[PDB]
Enzyme design. Structure first.
Site, PDB file in Angstrom:
ATOM      1  N   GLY A  56       0.785  -1.238   0.000  1.00  0.00           N
ATOM      2  CA  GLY A  56       0.000   0.000   0.000  1.00  0.00           C
ATOM      3  C   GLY A  56       0.814   1.284   0.000  1.00  0.00           C
ATOM      4  N   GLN A  57       2.119   1.196  -0.139  1.00  0.00           N
ATOM      5  CA  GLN A  57       2.979   2.376  -0.206  1.00  0.00           C
ATOM      6  C   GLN A  57       2.669   3.211  -1.451  1.00  0.00           C
ATOM      7  N   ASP A  58       2.917   4.497  -1.385  1.00  0.00           N
ATOM      8  CA  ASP A  58       2.621   5.440  -2.470  1.00  0.00           C
ATOM      9  C   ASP A  58       3.242   5.027  -3.806  1.00  0.00           C
ATOM     10  N   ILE A  60       3.783   1.990  -4.781  1.00  0.00           N
ATOM     11  CA  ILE A  60       3.198   0.710  -5.213  1.00  0.00           C
ATOM     12  C   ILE A  60       1.748   0.876  -5.679  1.00  0.00           C
ATOM     13  N   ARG A  61       1.021   1.885  -5.174  1.00  0.00           N
ATOM     14  CA  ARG A  61      -0.384   2.126  -5.558  1.00  0.00           C
ATOM     15  C   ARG A  61      -0.622   2.199  -7.075  1.00  0.00           C
TER      16      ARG A  61
END
Lengths: 167, 201, 311
Positions: A56-58, A60-61
């Site tokens: 859910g890291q920026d 990876i979104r």
């Protein structure tokens, strides 16, 4: 056994990986923020759920779009203690729900970390995410504690019943 | 003192497989391998060729050549032992010393070659150690798998138990509505040092 | 950079006898194949990329369907695939997909199989992307304390190459490897640690050698060769140190290993121009030529006597 593909997404530190391994291994895995994805097969009521836990890291979104194809159920995990990022979680959920590839996907929202004293309740998260504005989509919100495992099986039981009636 | 590359070549001069142990460009290594068959002198009683920049050390293997490319200042004694070790590794994977078998087993040969040489330096390995390292049979991995399979069995049993309890709870909810000493060790080294001192060192 | 200017660790000239497998066929075999079909498809992909074919469409297929497999052959083939596959965009930026591969390297560095850890550490010696190495540094450091010498020896080589290319990722590497060298018992691990110190910190290599200098004759031939290489480099840079090492090199002329005798004789000529030292080195070369049965050795050692005569 019916095989079902489930995508599990949400912000970083929402506890997605803890939920996945609590369901599979019965144990609490102390997880660092997932910098990738995990894939695990969980069996419930003769349905084999293949759950994709995507980070859910920026950074990876933007990659979540690659996992939308052939997704039958969407699990959105929210940190119910993280009041500041709830609007960000709403925007990201609404952006995912706008994708045509997810149109027929059943939405399960896990209001995770309900064990924390400042956690938003499932009703407050439902309003803040705007889930009542969703038309033509089957959704359910379950209060969960990934550490105790409370509410995880009730959420899966709802998902199993919805996906059984969709055929 | 650096082994640049190891290659298996046909007698016609076609390199089938080459592994480089130092940072070389593709054009450079392909150039060196293409020059080798033209530089090979027939009828000589030795198995090396020197250019201005590199030494080739080779061993004939029926229809093939095992070739090592080294620097001119490389230790030939170490390079020949290394060449003999490389030449013994090929028959362990390839039953016939032919281009087709080398091509089928090319990855197994590459994996074995990486066990012999690291960063241009020879590893202290024998054929039995190379076999053990390439088989990758780990006792720790077997123990770890056995533990993990046991945990997965327990988790599956617990998941089946909870699934029964949930299904039962739903059904119940629906229902309810002094000898002369001659020779001192090290005297030869002392005599050599004393001679060097007498020569002004 | 063009594939021809790139560093090439592997050349495979297989005649592509059969119809070159279509990218769609390879994709289907990688996604739906059994372990054998996936292994053969991955071998074909590696050979095609090595022969200059660009298969960017297969990268995510390999990440999704091949990378999570625990088959040892596939694990090794994947290390060769990651050696040759383009990791950067044309503008030199790391591909976003490589973040997923970095977590797989971290898992393989923590793998219960010691040979997977060692093979992954050997692969990391070829990695030039600092952004991929940075998140792996804790796992690489933990491999130095591994119970198997196979992991420890390759961990030293990985630390050496990371320090050489990216000093900022491991600025304490010379100190860490010195402490490793003092405590290590395995001869291959000692050699690799000492070899790193020769290139990274010669003073720490000399400090270690000074503690063991009287025992060098009892060391294995591999460690003796690397000690002779240090003595050569140090005495070449600093001629005042020659007087310290002449006695050690002369003792190595009596080594049981003919390789050590040859290197010790060559080094002795560089340490001393005294007639007695040159005579001892020349006699060692003559004795090697007479005792060694191999004509390759005889001819090359004769050329060392010819080089000596040019002075």
């Amino acid at each position: 056994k019916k095989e079902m593909r489930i995508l599990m997404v949400g912000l970083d530190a929402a506890g997605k990986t803890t939920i996945l391994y609590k369901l599979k291994l019965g144990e609490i895995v102390t997880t660092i923020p997932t910098i990738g994805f995990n894939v695990e097969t969980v069996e419930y009521k003769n349905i084999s759920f293949t759950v994709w836990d995507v980070g859910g890291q920026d950074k990876i979104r933007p990659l979540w779009r690659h996992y939308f194809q052939n997704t039958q159920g969407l699990i959105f995990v929210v940190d119910s203690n993280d009041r500041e990022r709830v609007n960000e979680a709403r925007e990201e959920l609404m952006r995912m729900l706008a994708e045509d590839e997810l149109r027929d996907a059943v939405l399960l929202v896990f209001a995770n970390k309900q064990d924390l004293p400042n956690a938003m309740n499932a009703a407050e998260i439902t309003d803040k995410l705007g889930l009542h504005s969703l038309r033509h989509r089957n959704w359910y919100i379950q209060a969960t504690c990934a550490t105790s495992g409370d509410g995880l099986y009730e959420g899966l039981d709802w998902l199993s019943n919805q996906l059984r009636n969709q055929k | 003192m650096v082994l640049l590359a190891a290659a298996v070549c046909t007698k016609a001069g076609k390199a089938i497989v080459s592994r480089q142990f130092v940072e070389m460009t593709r054009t450079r290594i392909e150039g060196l391998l293409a020059a080798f068959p033209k530089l090979m002198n027939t009828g000589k009683q030795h198995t090396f060729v020197e250019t201005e920049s590199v030494r080739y050390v080779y061993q004939p293997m029926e229809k093939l050549y095992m070739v090592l490319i080294t620097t001119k200042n490389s230790n030939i004694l170490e390079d020949l032992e290394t060449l003999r070790l490389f030449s013994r590794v090929i028959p362990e994977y390839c039953r016939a010393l032919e281009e087709n078998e080398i091509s089928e087993h090319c990855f197994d040969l590459i994996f074995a070659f990486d066990e012999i040489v690291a960063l241009g330096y020879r590893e202290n390995v024998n054929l039995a150690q190379i076999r053990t390292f390439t088989e990758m049979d780990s006792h720790e991995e077997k123990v770890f798998r056995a533990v993990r399979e046991t945990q997965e069995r327990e988790a599956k049993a617990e998941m089946r138990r909870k699934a029964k309890e949930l299904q039962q709870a739903r059904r119940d909810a629906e229902r309810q509505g002094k000898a002369l000493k001659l020779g001192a060790k090290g005297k030869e080294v002392d005599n050599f040092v004393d001679k060097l001192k007498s020569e002004g060192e | 950079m063009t594939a021809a200017e790139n560093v090439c660790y592997t050349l495979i000239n297989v005649p592509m006898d059969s119809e070159p497998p279509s990218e769609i066929s390879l994709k289907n075999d990688l996604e739906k194949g059994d372990v054998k079909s996936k292994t053969e498809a991955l071998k074909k992909v590696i050979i095609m990329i090595l022969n200059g074919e660009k298969l960017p469409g297969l990268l995510m297929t390999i990440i999704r369907f091949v990378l999570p497999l625990q088959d040892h052959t596939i694990k090794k083939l994947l290390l060769v695939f990651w050696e040759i596959v383009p990791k950067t965009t044309p503008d030199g930026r790391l591909l976003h997909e490589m973040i997923l591969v970095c977590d797989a390297y971290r898992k393989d560095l923590q793998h219960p199989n010691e040979f997977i850890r060692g093979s992954t550490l050997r692969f990391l010696c070829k990695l030039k992307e600092a952004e991929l190495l940075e998140p792996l540094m804790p796992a690489i450091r933990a491999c130095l304390e591994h119970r198997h010498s196979y992991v420890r020896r390759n961990a030293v080589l990985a630390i050496y190459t990371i320090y050489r290319n990216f000093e900022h990722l491991i600025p304490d590497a010379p100190e860490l490897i010195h402490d490793f060298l003092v405590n290590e018992k395995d001869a291959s691990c000692k050699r690799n640690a000492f070899m790193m110190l020769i290139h990274a910190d010669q003073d720490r290599a000399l400090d270690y050698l000074s503690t063991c200098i009287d025992q060098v004759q009892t060391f294995g031939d591999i460690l003796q060769l690397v000690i002779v290489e240090l003595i050569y480099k140090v005495c070449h840079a600093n001629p005042s140190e020659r007087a310290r090492f002449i006695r050690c090199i002369y003792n190595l002329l009596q080594s049981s290993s003919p390789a050590v005798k040859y290197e010790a004789a060559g080094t002795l000529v560089t340490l001393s121009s005294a007639p007695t030292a040159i005579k001892a080195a020349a006699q060692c070369y003559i004795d090697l030529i007479i005792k060694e049965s191999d004509n390759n050795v005889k001819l090359i050692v004769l050329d060392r006597l010819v080089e000596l005569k040019e002075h």
